[PDB]
């Protein structure tokens, strides 16, 4: 269960921490939020191997971009992801949400489903557990929310996704992307379950 949400001051990425091999939880404290640039992060869903391989290549491409042309746009990061996902669609099972903060463009969210298509959205949800919160998220999402409001929206949203989806669980990790910098938040079962 992964989501990225744009708010007034930037963007917030949210994810669960559960990795499954069948019905066995291989890792119950997984970090599904991965840095491709200082203020461009992504959420990974699908094959753990495929998404890591893609994320590792994109981080390389943007590092080399930065050396030559300076800080890349969130749109640019999304395009590199798309290029890998679209051209290798026959061999890849990767659903990636790209989220980043510019000063010019502020908070931006791009979702890349299996096909390798790109969609720019105010907020995005993906993963097995996302199906259970389409109704909730649509009813409860507003534009230009506060940081506290947006953290609550993601916490409540993933709380429900984790509750109903067996493949989702553990802790809720979040990454806040604003002008202020990069903040990592963690929320434990005892907190989010009683919501």
């Amino acid at each position: 269960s992964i989501m990225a949400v744009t708010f007034k001051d930037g963007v917030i990425l949210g994810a669960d921490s559960r990795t499954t091999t069948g019905a066995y939880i291989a890792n119950r404290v997984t970090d599904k939020l991965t840095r491709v640039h200082d203020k461009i992060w992504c959420c990974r869903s699908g094959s753990a191997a495929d998404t890591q391989a893609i994320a590792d290549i994109v981080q390389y491409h943007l590092e080399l971009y930065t050396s030559q042309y300076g800080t890349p746009s969130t749109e640019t990061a999304a395009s590199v992801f798309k290029e890998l996902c679209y051209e290798n669609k026959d061999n890849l099972t990767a659903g990636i949400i790209v989220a980043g903060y510019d000063d010019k463009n502020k908070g931006e969210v791009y979702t890349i489903p299996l096909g390798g298509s790109v969609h720019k959205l105010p907020y995005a949800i993906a993963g097995s557990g996302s199906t259970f919160i389409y109704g909730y998220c649509d009813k409860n999402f507003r534009e230009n929310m506060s940081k506290e409001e947006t953290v609550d929206f993601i916490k409540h949203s993933l709380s429900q996704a984790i509750k109903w989806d067996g493949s989702s669980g553990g802790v809720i990790r979040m990454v806040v992307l604003t002008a202020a910098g990069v903040e990592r938040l963690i929320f434990y079962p005892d907190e989010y379950e009683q919501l």
């Binding site: 269960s1 992964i2 994810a15 669960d16 559960r18 990795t19 499954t20 091999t21 291989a26 890792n27 599904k32 990974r44 869903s45 699908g46 094959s47 753990a48 191997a49 993906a126 993963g127 097995s128 557990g129 493949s167 989702s168």
Partner: peptide, 4 residues
């Protein structure tokens, strides 16, 4: 395999 490992696979949200």
């Amino acid at each position: 395999x490992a696979y949200x």
